[PDB]
Amino acid sequence: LTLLKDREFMPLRVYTRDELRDTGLLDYSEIQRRNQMHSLRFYDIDKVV
């Protein structure tokens, strides 16, 4: 009679949380983070005339 040997199970995921949050065409927070600093990027909002 032979004994069962030890096994170790690995945490296998088919898709990660990032992959599951990468299936849409646009991300609202990404667009808003990039576009709400348009005036900071392309203008000088601290100089007064």
């Binding site: 030890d6 170790e8 949380r17 927070s29 808003q32 983070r33 709400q36 600093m37 005036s39 900071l40 000088d44 909002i45 601290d46 100089k47 007064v48 005339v49």
Partner: protein, 294 residues
Amino acid sequence: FTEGIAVVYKENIAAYKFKATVYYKDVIVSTAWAGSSYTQITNRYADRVPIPVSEITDTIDKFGKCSSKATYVRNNHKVEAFNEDKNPQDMPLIASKYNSVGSKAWHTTNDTYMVAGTPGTYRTGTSVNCIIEEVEARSIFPYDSFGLSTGDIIYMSPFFGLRDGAYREHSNYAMDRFHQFEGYRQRDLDTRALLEPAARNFLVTPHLTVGWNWKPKRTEVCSLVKWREVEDVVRDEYAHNFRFTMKTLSTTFISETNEFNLNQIHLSQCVKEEARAIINRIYTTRYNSSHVRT
């Protein structure tokens, strides 16, 4: 084997959530064309402008009133605006009709001003509406910006300040837009009474002024969150590995024989003392007389 108590910690994936207030004025400019038998709005230019922190801390948090004259900066020029194109006043801040729990807002004007004129001419009006809203702010790692319930991204860390090395956080703004008031006593616009003193940051964004009570980064954000406290675990000593068997959860975790130094992980100051308190409570309530610590 080795019996003991364990606290399991998972990674914190949620955003850091706090509360702030937004102070801004709604500046609408309506242009009507009075015609033969009708009036036609030919333009309506709405704009949100900030309330400067001098005005806040000297009129709103002093008397609960807001000036009827907007003074701001557009196109690098110091522009103004007057409600109904009249002499400026200080109007009282009145609660919205929808002031349910949490999301509250106090404004001064329910009306929007416009004029038509004699048939054949254009006439221009102007509104100004002081609006103070309690919003829910929200920041995610690495906490160098926060978004508001109004939809606005504030390109400054929620922990930017002037003391405690906080001035070394991230900020996409000039240091002239940022104000900190140590010991500031906010005013509750409903009970008309000052709140308790607390350091308060103010930032004048081109379209609004954000104000939030300052709190240090070390005590508010944390990379790890408690998943499960386990009262009875068993640590085994398999070849090259530890094993943590938890018969109440029916879960077996497999570590290495080495300890993990939580100093390699960002923002891990919570775990040590939180787990110490939880484990001490569990021990004192369950294993006070049966076992002893090791």
